[PDB]
Structures are given as structure tokens and as C-alpha cells.
Amino acid sequence: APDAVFGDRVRRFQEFLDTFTSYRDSVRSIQVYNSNNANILPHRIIISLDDLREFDRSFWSGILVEPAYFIPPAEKALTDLADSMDDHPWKLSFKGSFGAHALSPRTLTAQHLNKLVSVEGIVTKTSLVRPKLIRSVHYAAKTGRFHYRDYTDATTTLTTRIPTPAIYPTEDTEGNKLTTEYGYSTFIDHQRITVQEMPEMAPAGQLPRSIDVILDDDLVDKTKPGDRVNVVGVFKSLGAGGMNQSNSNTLIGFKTLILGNTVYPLHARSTGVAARQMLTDFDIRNINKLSKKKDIFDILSQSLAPSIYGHDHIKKAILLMLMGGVEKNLENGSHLRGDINILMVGDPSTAKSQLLRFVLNTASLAIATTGRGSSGVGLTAAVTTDRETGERRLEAGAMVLADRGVVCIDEFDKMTDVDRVAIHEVMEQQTVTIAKAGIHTTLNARCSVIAAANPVFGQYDVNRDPHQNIALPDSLLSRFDLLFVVTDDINEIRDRSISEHVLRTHRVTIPFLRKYVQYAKERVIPQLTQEAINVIVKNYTDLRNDDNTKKSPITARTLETLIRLATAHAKVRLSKTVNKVDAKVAANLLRFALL
Amino acid sequence: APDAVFGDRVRRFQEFLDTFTSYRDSVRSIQVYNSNNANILPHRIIISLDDLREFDRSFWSGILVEPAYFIPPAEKALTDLADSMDDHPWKLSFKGSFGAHALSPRTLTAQHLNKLVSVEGIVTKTSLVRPKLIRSVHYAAKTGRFHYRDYTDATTTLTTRIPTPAIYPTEDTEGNKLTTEYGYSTFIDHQRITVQEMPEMAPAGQLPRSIDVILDDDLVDKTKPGDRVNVVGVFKSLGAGGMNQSNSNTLIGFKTLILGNTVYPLHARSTGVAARQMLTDFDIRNINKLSKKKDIFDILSQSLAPSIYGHDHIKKAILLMLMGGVEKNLENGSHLRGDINILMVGDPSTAKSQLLRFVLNTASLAIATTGRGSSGVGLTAAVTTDRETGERRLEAGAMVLADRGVVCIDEFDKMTDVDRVAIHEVMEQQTVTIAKAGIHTTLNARCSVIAAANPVFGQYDVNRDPHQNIALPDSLLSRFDLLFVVTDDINEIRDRSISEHVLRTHRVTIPFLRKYVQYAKERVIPQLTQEAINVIVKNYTDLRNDDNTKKSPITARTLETLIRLATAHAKVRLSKTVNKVDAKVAANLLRFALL
Amino acid sequence: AALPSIQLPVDYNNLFNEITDFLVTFKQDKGPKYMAMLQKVANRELNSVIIDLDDILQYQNEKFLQGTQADDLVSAIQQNANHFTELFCRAIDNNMPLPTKEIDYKDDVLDVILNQRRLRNERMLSDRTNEIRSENLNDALREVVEDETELFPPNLTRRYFLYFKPLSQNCARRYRKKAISSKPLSVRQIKGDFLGQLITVRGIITRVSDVKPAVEVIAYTCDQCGYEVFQEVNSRTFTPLSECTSEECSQNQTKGQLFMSTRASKFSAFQECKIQELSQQVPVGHIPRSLNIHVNGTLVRSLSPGDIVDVTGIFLPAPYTGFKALKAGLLTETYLEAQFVRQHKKKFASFSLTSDVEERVMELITSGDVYNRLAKSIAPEIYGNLDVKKALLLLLVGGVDKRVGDGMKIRGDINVCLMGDPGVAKSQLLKAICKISPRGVYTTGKGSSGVGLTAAVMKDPVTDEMILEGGALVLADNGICCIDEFDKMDESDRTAIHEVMEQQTISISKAGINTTLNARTSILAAANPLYGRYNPRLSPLDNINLPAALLSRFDILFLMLDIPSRDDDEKLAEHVTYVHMHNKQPDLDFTPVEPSKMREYIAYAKTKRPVMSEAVNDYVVQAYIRLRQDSKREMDSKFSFGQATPRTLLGIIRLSQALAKLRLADMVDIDDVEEALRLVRVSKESLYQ
DNA sequence: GCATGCATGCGCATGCATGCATGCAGCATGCATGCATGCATGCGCATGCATGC
Numbered sequence A, B: 001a002p003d004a005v006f007g008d009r010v011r012r013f014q015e016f017l018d019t020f021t022s023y024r025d026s027v028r029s030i031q032v033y034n035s036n037n038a039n040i041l042p043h044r045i046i047i048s049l050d051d052l053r054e055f056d057r058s059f060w061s062g063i064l065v066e067p068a069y070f071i072p073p074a075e076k077a078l079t080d081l082a083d084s085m086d087d088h089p090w091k092l093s094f095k096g097s098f099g100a101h102a103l104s105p106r107t108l109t110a111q112h113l114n115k116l117v118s119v120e121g122i123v124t125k126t127s128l129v130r131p132k133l134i135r136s137v138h139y140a141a142k143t144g145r146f147h148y149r150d151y152t153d154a155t156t157t158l159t160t161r162i163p164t165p166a167i168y169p170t171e172d173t174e175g176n177k178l179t180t181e182y183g184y185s186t187f188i189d190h191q192r193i194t195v196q197e198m199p200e201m202a203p204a205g206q207l208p209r210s211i212d213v214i215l216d217d218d219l220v221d222k223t224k225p226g227d228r229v230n231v232v233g234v235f236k237s238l239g240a241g242g243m244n245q246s247n248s249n250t251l252i253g254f255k256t257l258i259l260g261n262t263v264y265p266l267h268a269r270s271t272g273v274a275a276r277q278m279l280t281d282f283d284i285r286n287i288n289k290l291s292k293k294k295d296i297f298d299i300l301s302q303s304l305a306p307s308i309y310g311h312d313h314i315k316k317a318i319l320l321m322l323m324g325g326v327e328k329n330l331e332n333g334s335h336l337r338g339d340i341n342i343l344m345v346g347d348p349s350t351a352k353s354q355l356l357r358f359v360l361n362t363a364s365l366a367i368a369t370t371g372r373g374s375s376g377v378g379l380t381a382a383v384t385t386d387r388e389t390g391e392r393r394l395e396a397g398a399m400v401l402a403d404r405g406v407v408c409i410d411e412f413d414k415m416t417d418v419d420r421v422a423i424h425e426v427m428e429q430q431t432v433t434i435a436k437a438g439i440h441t442t443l444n445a446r447c448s449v450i451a452a453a454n455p456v457f458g459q460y461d462v463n464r465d466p467h468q469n470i471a472l473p474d475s476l477l478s479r480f481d482l483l484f485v486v487t488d489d490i491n492e493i494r495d496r497s498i499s500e501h502v503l504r505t506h507r508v509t510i511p512f513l514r515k516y517v518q519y520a521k522e523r524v525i526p527q528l529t530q531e532a533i534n535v536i537v538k539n540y541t542d543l544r545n546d547d548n549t550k551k552s553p554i555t556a557r558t559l560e561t562l563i564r565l566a567t568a569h570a571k572v573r574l575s576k577t578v579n580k581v582d583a584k585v586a587a588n589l590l591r592f593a594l595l
Numbered sequence C: 001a002a003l004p005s006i007q008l009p010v011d012y013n014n015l016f017n018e019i020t021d022f023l024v025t026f027k028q029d030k031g032p033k034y035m036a037m038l039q040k041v042a043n044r045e046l047n048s049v050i051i052d053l054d055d056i057l058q059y060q061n062e063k064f065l066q067g068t069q070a071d072d073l074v075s076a077i078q079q080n081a082n083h084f085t086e087l088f089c090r091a092i093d094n095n096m097p098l099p100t101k102e103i104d105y106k107d108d109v110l111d112v113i114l115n116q117r118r119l120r121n122e123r124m125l126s127d128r129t130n131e132i133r134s135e136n137l138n139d140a141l142r143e144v145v146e147d148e149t150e151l152f153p154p155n156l157t158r159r160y161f162l163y164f165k166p167l168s169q170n171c172a173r174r175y176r177k178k179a180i181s182s183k184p185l186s187v188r189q190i191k192g193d194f195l196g197q198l199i200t201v202r203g204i205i206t207r208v209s210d211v212k213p214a215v216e217v218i219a220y221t222c223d224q225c226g227y228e229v230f231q232e233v234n235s236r237t238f239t240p241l242s243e244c245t246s247e248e249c250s251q252n253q254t255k256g257q258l259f260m261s262t263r264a265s266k267f268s269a270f271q272e273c274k275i276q277e278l279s280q281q282v283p284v285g286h287i288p289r290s291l292n293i294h295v296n297g298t299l300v301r302s303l304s305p306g307d308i309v310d311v312t313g314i315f316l317p318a319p320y321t322g323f324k325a326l327k328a329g330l331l332t333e334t335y336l337e338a339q340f341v342r343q344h345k346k347k348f349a350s351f352s353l354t355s356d357v358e359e360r361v362m363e364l365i366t367s368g369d370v371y372n373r374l375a376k377s378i379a380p381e382i383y384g385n386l387d388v389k390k391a392l393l394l395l396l397v398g399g400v401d402k403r404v405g406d407g408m409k410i411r412g413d414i415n416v417c418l419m420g421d422p423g424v425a426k427s428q429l430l431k432a433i434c435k436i437s438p439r440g441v442y443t444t445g446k447g448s449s450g451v452g453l454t455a456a457v458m459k460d461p462v463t464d465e466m467i468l469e470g471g472a473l474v475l476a477d478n479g480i481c482c483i484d485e486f487d488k489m490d491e492s493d494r495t496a497i498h499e500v501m502e503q504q505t506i507s508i509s510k511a512g513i514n515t516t517l518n519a520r521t522s523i524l525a526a527a528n529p530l531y532g533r534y535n536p537r538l539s540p541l542d543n544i545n546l547p548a549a550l551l552s553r554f555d556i557l558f559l560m561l562d563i564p565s566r567d568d569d570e571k572l573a574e575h576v577t578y579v580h581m582h583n584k585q586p587d588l589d590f591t592p593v594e595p596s597k598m599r600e601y602i603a604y605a606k607t608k609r610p611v612m613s614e615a616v617n618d619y620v621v622q623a624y625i626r627l628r629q630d631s632k633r634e635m636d637s638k639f640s641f642g643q644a645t646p647r648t649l650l651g652i653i654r655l656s657q658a659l660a661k662l663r664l665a666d667m668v669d670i671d672d673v674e675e676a677l678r679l680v681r682v683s684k685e686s687l688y689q
Numbered sequence D: 001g002c003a004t005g006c007a008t009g010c011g012c013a014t015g016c017a018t019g020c021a022t023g024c025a026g027c028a029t030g031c032a033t034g035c036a037t038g039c040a041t042g043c044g045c046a047t048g049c050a051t052g053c
């Protein structure tokens, strides 16, 4: 029956929604889109706990400490507002500062039960999305009428209710037989996941802690295992902890879990989640203005890792790798690569690792690896596992996670043949093939690679040809688009200058650079032009028919590399077509790298 | 949940109420009356089964044979129409022809269960009107909140429902104590009665059959024991006939009773229920026109019992008795009688019993009795009884039921002193006094009396004075307003005339006479006038100071009788004041009776 | 959720504040009325508090007329009376002043115990405060002191009862309100919707139960821990406790056995009464119904059988008590809880002089001619019969009882018999007298017989004891018994009236009863000659049926005959016809006095006790000698209803005393005896026409 | 080129969570019956009344 407190809380939340007007127009926009586009959007809105606190502190604390009494009124108020303002029920999600209610699975104790919490962790295992039966519909042959029934369980609402275990109807009230209508029944999705403490925050040498989460309807497939997730939900207890009946066992307690209502994936270094930013009109105006200056490439290249001295060409190459080219697919089904790869060989104090870590820190999706750190299955994802459902399947590895991203390899020359043969396929076909007992599949691994290695004799020697100093298979070298050789030669003036630069350090910004690269990579797709065609033809002919000794061989991969660099420079320019200037820049850079 | 067939039936009955336009205006009238006057009228109306049959035979049969599925829809439709038309739930009653579904307690069998029935019978015993608890309200001291709870049982709904035996609350949900609010709770009345087959129809020498009935709310006190009643309701079965549990006993069957929804009292001869007719505008016009003629008294007098010959003065006296006088009550609390009393003594073939039976048949409320048929308590209601509740009280007798009516007594002289002394008080003070063990009360007995008696010597003798011929107490003879003596003397011409009249018989209407009497007795109350005062004074003085031998003595009762007769004649005239003509008619009739 | 909540337009804190302000502020048109009442209560000169709603209405209107807001406490109390009792009790307890008189050996044990309890309360409070301060761990100190200590609740320290009384029609009419609580109703009209309200019922009592103790709180004492345990009870039955519930025994492993202590308990004086409908309220052709009333506290013994009263009360329900098989849902039984009683006719015993009565009585006596003025005022619509009206008035006033010592007694009441021809308004006069009397009973011949008179043995429902229920004679004790159709009574009844009119008592010796009843009542009888009209050709004693001794024992005997006379018949006819044409008497030079003032004057007169002296004694003895000498000759000629006897002298004495009392004098005078002899002589005038 | 040592995959034993039945014993509960209680019933006696003589 109606309740006075319930009505008062409903009216108070209605006043809150009246004073704050953003959510009203958000709901109107959702309905407008769903009407116009018939894809359909769900009925859910996000509210600000900070605004709630500023408006009504008592109501704020009520939601925070006793959600079971304060949320359903708000949901009803939102539903009423939507149904009034239009020409399913709606749902709420919470953002803002949770204060002492932001915890981790280790610091989550019984004193938080029945309270709204926000946990952070790493998803360890997801469950299979199964439908749940809500309403059943039946048809009677003898009478030509349709009957129906409804079902519910304990986890569908916050407040406890008296169980009503209705049975599945097979007969009519009079004894007639019934026929089920699968097409007219109603089903809802359902999933369960587990969250664990992050590995970079849990104490070392101690076993981890974990907590279960239940998701329903439209929050059912928002994450994958191995992800960093922040979940805001209601910590709840269910059933009776062996109290009912004798149940002599006293070891077990009360089952607990979180009826999650908000899930957010978080980005982190060497993690499978791509970082994305929201672009404002101010950002777009600034980027578009900056596009028109001639030395844009120079300023952008210099912006990277300003703490390091020189290496201007290497910085340019890294920027080109970050921007990337374009990949082509033909109606036949053939695939043409569009990524770039970089290898650095140098003297043992040339900031190779510093640049590599900078790329790891700045790239939107990058994964870091060392020579012998990961071996065998860890790179190709060729591991096979199984659940208790009995089926075996695969769980992704380094390069598989690195799809559409970057892979940093440090101490490259320490690898082995068994995995260099594997990485050949990744660099060229951009694909991984697995054939084990009961598994025969093919996984996309479109990623770029940057690697560093040391010369055989400790220091690069000019008295010997490049082969004796590098000592890597020519087939492998052919796959790397760019190779650089860097040596430190003692010189009074250079040493002086590097000294002042380093002392200065020991006593365009990166976020804007990231926004720039995101927009450029997402929006612009240039095409080839006859001018560039001719320039690249001439340059490739000359390189293939010159006698100079080069640091790397020459194949058609070099021509494709010219194409990719020209396209990437055009992408930097944000022009819709490649140009003679871009072709010349690519040719100059490759010539410098080879000579 | 909503039901398609339920909605369809609601729509159909809505169409019925739309096509018939009397019930809508009736509901409007009820609501208008209640709003204007705030006494309150109940939310109920009556429907015509004949109209239902003419409109939709299917719905007609549905209501007649399966009320449990067809009535609640109609009730909901009526409630919806009322709530729509207005600027509690409403209820329905049935009138019309029930065909085979009009039964009696003897002919009511199990094959009629769950079907709407109409039974006729005599009420044998009612129950004490008790309140029933519906909604309870409570107050919490520690919090200042008002809580409530609802209750229900099996008899408040036609369709079976799953029991929900909610307990009476004494604590709050948190453990606080609770206080009850009797003024804010809600209670409903409830009565139970028993109906039995009439004695004019039951088999003789055979025990009778009876059936229970339950009444609720506004139908709770519409009858008393001894009435002839017609009840229309639903014949239902309740509980389980010992089926549940073992219940080795098999003799008992299913409890049954009627959820009465319409009750009607019926008038019958020698019964305590008065007869009343509805007056139409045509009736009023005709009666008012007739009143204006000069011989109206003669016409009405001749209308009575036209099959009998002569006795014009007796017919006039009977009419005056029917119309009656006026009774006066003083501020001191004194009471002055206003009834009339008639006695006839005559030869044993003068149609005395015929006139007695005619007045029995035509009077609105009359009770018939013979000399020795009723004796002792049977006349004064001096019997005492008691239920199982422990309380003793009285049950009415002949004269007590005859209140505001007429009592016919045949073979008057056969009575005894034990009850002549009792009837003295009824005829003069018009009250009955009882004083038994634990009872001391007084019952109003304002009734009029007509009686007939025989002479002592078989035939009236003219050679002796009236004392020897009548031989009844002078005090008793004083109480009778009019006394007539009738003798049959042989005469050739009179015998001839009566012969033709009787042979004619052997080979204004009463209903209109009844309507006339009802209107006259209800509407007009005349007042005394100085002319009549003077005429009555003169006539009473003359009678008291005349020496002629009379059949009866002279007291102030004669003066009061003169006043009463004058007032009754004015009532017949439909005038607001007594007049000289009425006074002279009264005096002339009294003189004829006495001489 | 289960047990939802609802919102109502009622706030109790505002009402409680208003109650406090009203109790401390009200002034009638001296200090506050209720504060003075509370001072008396504390000083132990009162036991009951009466809250009148006219005062509350006046307070509310006074607050309104000068602007400030006030709530409708009147409507709130009217609709939910049962809840405001506790509010008022607490408001009063918060303000009760201290006693100004010490407690002595002549005080009630109840007050002694209450004082001891209050002092003990103060002792624990002070001890706890001292102990807590000693620890060195003032509002906080006080609060912890109350929190950590046990006390005797206020209900076990109260000593007074509280009652409400309804809103007067006059006050409601003057203030333009509708006094619901003071609209009389019959048991017929009281339905379920009236439950929980304060209502007024008009009815006639029929049965009252004896006063018995009803327990409200039982008290036990634990010898182990020395605690006192109090158990509430509000049901028709309860269960006694067995083991202690105090804190010490609760925590300990060995618990003590409770015992019962009657003196410490909380008892209430309880009666139950049955009220019945009046004749004029019953619809046509129906039987009157009844209703149940409960009386608690100091309001007991205020109702007696035969009283026509207006009772104010709260209407409350009670659990069902009929057969199970006829139960359909939550059926309930109802009763009324009494708060105020108003009699329709004030008893003489309750008389007390006062300004209001004094002014009316002095006005009447100043008007003069009290004797005839009152005599003509009995049944003023009946013509003539002045002498019998005077005799009836003297019967109403009564004589003087005399206590002669040695266990003997002389009656002081007057007995009257009217014997007359049919149609002379004897029954009218009988009914008028029975109505005017404050305890008048009316009876007619065969209607009442046997146990109808005297009493019968029955079993009380309320209590489980046998009792005797009285008849008309016992119901009319200290009053008038009017008998119609006297000569038609049975021999046993005639013997009953014989013995009553002889020595004011009734002796019964039958199976299961051997006792005597007190019947201090006067007799007014009516009778009719044996042959209808009186026959002058036969002797008076053969013209009547009743025994000559029974006739003789009457103080006054009147003979009323109907002799036609063309002159007086005109006057009688004019009188009667005028009475019918109007509803009032014809005389304009005389204004009748209403029954209320008549009862007032008679009650005042009954307080006197005149005495007799030597000159009047000599006159009386001479008159008695003459009368006794004369009567013997008349009796010899068989022309007298009876010979003169000492009862005649006693009747003359009683009539003289009654006339003196009516004159309101301590001294008797010769004129009184003159009038008495005139009356006793004219008693038989019609026999000499 | 040639010999060793490490990783790596294959194969073999075994423990261990789920899920079910069956004989058994324990514990709430219906059921036989033991009863007081309050009530109505008929069952004769005393007798007031009406009748015949």
C-alpha cells in the first residue's frame, strides 16, 4: 500500500530534479534519439553525488548509507518525470566523490554491508551471458485464449519481500492442455563476474582478495578478463547463514556480493584498455589552427621527450609510427599492411630505454616486454585453458592484446629462433595461427613494433661491416621498416653542451599531443597522388640500382615503406591527399637511416 | 493482474448502462441529494432483469447462472460511471422475473448452488447487529507516525481467494510500542437472520425447512421477526466439508447460506407488515377532483362491501373508524386518545362475520382474532423468552403488533375477565404494562377495535331492556365508542328484495378506496372550530339531561366520541377544519346508534 | 513494506502545549480555577477532576478574538476522547503543587504509601547523583542520573481520577457551534461509526451490579533482590508471574520466587449497568433494545434502577463472545464507558440550600397562597376535583415519622384510595401523580402479579453470586406506588399490600428464601364499584368488594359519583373542548407552577419537623371524642364505610403535620387541624346527596 | 663441426569437488477421551378460576 515516507522522498527527489535541469534534457535527448532511429538506447542516467550533497545533505547521506530506502523512490521519480515529459522503468548511476565509501576488495569489511560502495580492481573471470525468464505466455487450443504468468527472484530488488514461488503452468484452470509461445515470452540477460585487487597495489608475497559482482540487462558485456575496472554498487547479503533448520555446520557465514549498477573501465600502463579523451570545440579549434603552420612537423617532433638531447630523426620516426599509415583490403580478400616498425642499435649509454619507456608512457595502447622476460606462449597467446563447462578456449597474450597498438621490446637481440619465427608472421601477415588439440583458429594481431638491441662487440665498430656488428638474420631485418645506428663519439663541445643540458634538467604539452594524435588517427584518411607515385618510383629505382653499401637489404618492402611514410606524413599534415613534399620527406628520412 | 474477459464484460455492461438511461439519472439524483444535504443515502441501485434479457440474452443467462463471474464486472462498471459523472464502491440489486430461480426453502436443493436465487418465507429469528473490524490505525510514540493495517474474510467477496491472515499489530517494525486509534479505525455492521417457509404454504403435519442469510452494511436492520420476506441473493457453499485432514467423521456436509443482496417485506392478512401503495399524479388529480363533490361520504359509504344489503349506518361507522380522528399530547406529557371503537350485537344471520372479514381484507394493517382462540399472553405480548446470550425480553402479541392499526374480534362475548381487564387498558390508555421477574416495561398499543357479539337468548328480545339482552359490564360498554343492535324482522317486501339482490350476486374499486384512505390519513389534520364546539356542547348537554332509555350509559367518553367523529368526518372531507355540517353528521349518527 | 505509514492532520505536541497553557491560564467570568482545584487535590480534600468542554471552547474563542492562533482541542477530544486522558493526566502531574498540610495519623493509607514512594524516589535520585559525582570521571550529570536509575512511574503515584463532561447546547448555540457530544440518542441509533467518540445517551436504567474491586496493576515482591515487580492488566483474565524479572535476578543464576501483595496493587471500583430505550423512541411495532454501561472510580453508586437519565460516555469495542460457528471475521462487542450522569428528576435526599434555589423558593413563598396555588397545579387539564387534588398534594408532602424508643416506630406516610364511577379521570390523576413523583411507580391489576411485586431470586451475570430483584413495591421504595383496578387483584397481592401498608415491610418464606424486605412507600389506589355504577339502594360496604379492614386502614378514602347536572355539565364540556381545541388550560387568572419548582418546594419543605403542643392536643382529643361518638350511630344504620378508630386520629395528626410542613413552620396551629377535619369530613359528602 | 646441459612436451598415477540416493532415527502433532459448565426440558404439585347444582 502507499507509504507516506515513500511519497515524501519521491517528492523531494522530484524537487531535486526540478532544480537541476541537465538530467531532464538528457532524458529528453535519449527519447528523441530512440524515436528518430526507429539501434536503441537504454533508459539510464548518471547523477552527481556532489550536486546531491550541495542540494540536500540529509538525502545525500541517506542514499550513501541506506540506499535500500532512498534509491527506489528516486527511480520512481525519474520514471514519472520521463513518462510525463514524453509526447520500461528508468535507472540511475552514480559518479563523484564517495569519500570513505571508495574501497578495495582487501579493505571491504562487514561494517559496509547494505551500503553503497565503489571498488577498484582487475577483472579475473567473466561468466557466460544467459537469458533469464521473466514472463511466460501460453495458448489454449480448446478455447483459443492466451494466458500468461510472471516470475521474480531475490536479486531483482533491494528490499526484501515475501517469496512467491509460482510454478510453471502446463494446464488450464479447467484441465485443458497448454502450448508455450517462445516468441511472445520475455527473457532478460544476466552475468556474473569476479573482481580482484590490482597487482600493482596488493602487498607482495601475500595472497589476493576477490569479490563477486552481478550484472543484468544492459550492463552485461562491458568488460573482458584482465581488465582494470571500477565498479559502483550495493554491497549486500543474501539467504540465511545456516540459521534456518538445524544446519549444525557453523563454519559458513552469509553469502555476499555486489548488485553492481555502474561499471567503468580504467586505462593503465601495459594494459589492454585503450585511453580516450573527450574533445571540446576549444581543442578542435586549437588543433585546426596549429595544422596551418609550416613547421608543424618540426615542433611536434621536438616536443617528444625534451629531456633527451638530439636524436631528432629518431623522434620524427617515433611520431610517424604513432600517427601510422593506412591499410588496404581488396575485394578479392587480400590484405596490405599499413603499420611501421622501428629498430635501434646503439652504444650502451644512448637513452634507448628512456625513449622506449617514453613511448610506453605516451602511446594510447602500448605493451612493454623484455628479451627473455616473455617467451613461448606468452607472446603468441597460444595458451589453452578451460572452465568447468568442459570447453577449451584461448586467452590472449602480449601481441594479441596489442591489437591496433604498440609493442615495445627491450633487449631484442636476446630472443630465440623459436619465437622470432613466430614474430615474423605478426610483423608481416599481422595475424596469429594456432593449431592445438581441438583448437584451430586465427587471431588478428595488427600491431606496430619498436625494439632496441646492442652490438655484438659491446660498442659499435666502424672498422667492420654492418653485418658483423649487427648479426641478425637478413629475413628478420627486412621486416623492420626503419633501422637506426647510434654511437657516442667523444667531443669537447658536444660533451660540454650535453653537460649543461643535463644540469638544466636536474634542477606543446603531452595531453594536447595525445589529443592531437587521437583526432588525426580517427578523422583523416588520405589517398595517393601521381606526383608521389613518380617521386617514389624514382627513389626506389635509384636505391635498388645504386652501389653504396647499406645497413639493410632492399626489397619491395622498402617501396611499401616509402608509401607508408608518405601517407603518415600526409596524416600529420591533416591533408586528404599525399603530396610531393611528404614523399620527399619520407625519402630523405629513409636515405638518412640507410646512410 | 488485468484480465481480458473481465475487461470485455466491463465494457459490455458499460454499453448496457449507456443504452438504458434511467440508472444514470438515478445515480446522479443520489449524489445530488447527498451533496446538497451535506443524512446520507447508500451507494446502491436496482436493475431490471427483463431489460437485461431484452438487451443481451447471453449476459442475462451469465448473471442468472454464474453470478460469481458476471456481477463484479457490472459493479465495477457502475462504480466507474459514477466516478466519471460526479463533479465507496456502489452496489447492485435485482428485480424482475426469475423464472425457475424463484424458489422456497423446501424446494432449494444443491443443484442451485452458486446461482442467484429468490426465496420467499417468514423471518423466524434475527441476530444482534455487531460491528466488524476492517482497517486498524495505530500511533507510534517514539517516532510520531501513524501506521495502519487491513483485514478481510471469506464472505466479503464472491470469488475464492487465497487466505491472508494478517495479525493484529502491537509493535513497530523497529520494536517501538504502538497505541490504537479507535476513532480513526473503521468498522462495518453485520447481521445474520433465518428464513422459513410460510405457514400458509408449508405441508401440514410436516416439520418446516429453513435457510440462513447474512446481511452487511446498509441492509442490516430492514426486518423484524414474524415478517413475510422475499430475499434475492447468491446461494453459496463455504469451507471444506471435512475433506481437509483425516476428519474421520463423514456425516457433516458443506456449510451453505445466502449472501443476501436484496430484501423486500411483503404484506399479508393477519400480519404485522403494513400495506402501502405509490401514488401517481393521475391518482392525486382523481382523488382531489372526487373530494369536491357533495355526496362523497355517501358514495364511499356505499362502496364498502356492496354484496351485503343495507346496514348503511354500520358502513359509515366502519369508514369513520378507518379514517380515524386525531390524538393530542400536552407539554405536561398527558395523552388524549384519537381512535374509534365499534361493537355490534345482533341476530345470528346478519353478516356480522362477513363485515368483519371485509374490514380484515381491506384495512392496511389489521389482525383478526376470535373469542377463545387467543387468551392470556397471546393478546398482551406478556410472554418472555431468551437467547443463548442470556438476556430475557418480550415478543409481541396480537394488540402489540396491531399498533397504529385495527383489531377484529369475533365472538366477543366469549372472552373471560382475566383478559377483559387487560383490554381495558389497551382500549383507554393505549398502553400495555408488564412486570415479571427481571422485566419492567411499557409497550405502545395505539390500535382501534371492531367487535361483534350475540344476544343472550339467541335472538334479540324487544320485551326486555337492553341490560338483560346484552349482559356485559357497564364499564366495558362505556369504553366502546359506538354500539349497534341489529335484528332481522320478517317482511314480505324486504325478503323479496334481498332475494333478488342475492340472486343477482350469485351470477369505486377497493384499490382506489385504499389509495384514498392512505392519502387522507397521511396528509390532512383538521382543527376544531367554534361552531362545532357550540354544537357538540349543546348536543352533549341534551343527551345527558334527557330521560329517554338508552342502550348505553352517558359519560365524558360520549363528548370525546362526538369530537372524534366530527374530526374524522372533516378528515373525509379533506378540509383543514371541522365544520357545523360535520358536527351535525356526528351528532345524528350518535343519536341513531343510541335510539 | 509491511505495516505502512499514513499521514493525518493531527499533531500531539501542539495539543499538549495548548493543554498546559489552558490548565495554567484559564479564568472564569481569584487564581486559576484548575490551579486551585489542584491545590485542594494535593492537600487531600478531593479525589476527582472534572474537565468541562465549555471552558475549553471559551479559551479557544478568547484566543481567536484577539488574533493569536489556537487549535480545535474541542473537536480533537470529541473525536478521539480515549487518547486525551493520558495527555491531561501527564499535563496535570507536571504542575501539581506541593501539599501545604503535613501528613498525620488521620490520613488515608493510600496517601501514606504514595508519600513514601515519592520520598523513596527522591532518595535514589540523590544517592545516584552523589555516587556518580564521587568518581571524577550539570545537565549531563543529571541526564545520566535519570538514564541509569529506576523509578516508580507516575501512574503508581497519582491519587486522583479524571473525567470529561459534554458541551452544553446553550454554549454551542451562543458560540455558533454544533455540540455533537450533547445530542441525546437512543440505543437504536448508536451504530458502528460512532465507536471511539464521546456521546450522550438518554435512557432508563434497569439493572445495576454491585461495586467490586477491579485490578489494574498487580504488585509482587522479590525477597532475593528486594525489588517490586508491577504487572499491568487490561483483560477479563490474566496470568500470575512465577519468577523474578528485576535486573539483579535476571543477571544472576539463582532467581527468587515472586509473591503477591494486595496492598501495593492498583485497584479500581467497577460497576456495570444496563440501560433501556424509552417508549417514545421505539419505532412503531418494535420492541425496545438495551445497552451496556461501565462505571469506574468515584462515579459509582450514582445509578439506581428505574432512573431516567442522560449518560455521557466514550464508546469503545470489546472482544466477540458469541458462538464460534457464527463468527465471520473480526466481530466485536460494544459498551459505553461512563463520564457524567444527569438525572431527569432530582432526588429529595440530595437537597441543599443555595442562592439559586433560595431566590426561586422565596419568590414562590412571597407570591402567597402556596397551598391552593400548588394544589390547583396538579394535572391542571382536569376540571374540578380541588379537594382530591389537595389531598394528593398532602400525600406527596407526607407527614412526620416518630421514633418512640424501645425499638418501636410510627409511620409518617399517607395512604389514599379513590373509589369512583366510570369515566372520571381516576387513571389520569394516577398517571399524573406517578409522573410528578421522583420515584413514582405505576401498576394496573393483572399486568403485574406474584414476583412482579415483591422480589425474585436470580443469578448475577457480572458477578457469580445470587441476588434478589425487586418488584414494583421495592422499586418504588421511598416513593409513591400507584395502583389501578385495585379491586381486581389476587388475594396474595392484596395481602402483600396489606402488610406493606401496615408496617412498611414484606416477609417472604418460600423454597430458597426466608427474609424481609423494606418497602417504605406510600399507596395511591383506584377502584370502581362492584356493579359498575354506584347503587344508592345498597349499603356502601355491599357496593364494594374489598375487605372493610382494608378500606379502614387507608388514611384517606374518596367516593366519586357521576350525578347528571345540566349546569356543571356545561362547564365540564367547555373545559374539555377548550383543552382539545388548544393544548393548554382555559383559565387566565392562574399560572401553573412547573414540576421542577414543585419538586424544589416539596424537597425544601420535607426538611422541617413541626411539633405538637397542649392546646392543639386538647382540641384534637375533643374532636376525636365527638367524631367517635357520632360515627357509631351511623355504622349501626348500615350507612358507613367503617366505624371511627384510633387510625383515624393518627391520620388527622399526620395531615395536620403535613399542613404545618407545607406552611414551613416548626409550630403546628389549630387552623391546620381545622383544615384536616374539613378534608376528612368532605371525603364522604357525595354519599349524602 | 662436436659434446653437453637446459627447457619442453608427453604420459601416469591420484586426490577431490559435485550431486544423489537410502536406511534410519528423532520430533512435532493429530487424535482419543476426560470434563466442567451452562442450558433447556418435562415433569408433577398447588391452586385460582369457571362450571354445574
Ligand SMILES: Nc1ncnc2c1ncn2[C@@H]1O[C@H](COP(=O)(O)OP(=O)(O)O)[C@@H](O)[C@H]1O
Binding pocket: A307, A308, A309, A310, A347, A348, A349, A350, A351, A352, A353, A354, A502
Ligand atoms: N642524449 C641524451 N640526453 C640526455 N641524457 C642521456 C642521453 N643519453 C643518455 N642519457 C642518460 O644516460 C642514461 C642512460 O640510461 P639507459 O637508457 O638505461 O642506457 P641505454 O638506453 O643506453 O641502455 C639515462 O639515465 C639518461 O638520463
Ligand SMILES: Nc1ncnc2c1ncn2[C@@H]1O[C@H](COP(=O)(O)OP(=O)(O)O)[C@@H](O)[C@H]1O
Binding pocket: B307, B308, B309, B310, B347, B348, B349, B350, B351, B352, B353, B354, B498, B502
Ligand atoms: N344483509 C344481508 N344481505 C345479504 N346477505 C346476507 C345479509 N345478512 C346475511 N347474509 C348472508 O347470510 C350469511 C350469514 O353468515 P354469517 O356472517 O356467518 O352470519 P352471522 O354474521 O350473522 O353470524 C352470509 O353468508 C351472507 O351471505
Ligand SMILES: Nc1ncnc2c1ncn2[C@@H]1O[C@H](COP(=O)(O)OP(=O)(O)O)[C@@H](O)[C@H]1O
Binding pocket: B428, B556, B557, C381, C382, C383, C384, C421, C422, C423, C424, C425, C426, C427, C428, C429, C572, C576
Ligand atoms: N373531570 C374531567 N375533566 C376532563 N376530562 C375527564 C374528566 N373526567 C373524565 N375525563 C375523561 O374521561 C376519560 C376517563 O378515563 P380514565 O382516566 O380511565 O378514568 P376512568 O378509569 O374513570 O374511566 C379520560 O380520558 C378523561 O380525559
Ligand SMILES: [Mg+2]
Binding pocket: A351, A352, A353, A354
Ligand atoms: Mg637502455
Ligand SMILES: [Mg+2]
Binding pocket: B351, B352, B353, B354
Ligand atoms: Mg357471523
Ligand SMILES: [Mg+2]
Binding pocket: C426, C427, C484
Ligand atoms: Mg381507569
Ligand SMILES: [Zn+2]
Binding pocket: C222, C223, C224, C225, C226, C227, C244, C245, C246, C248, C249, C256
Ligand atoms: Zn528478584
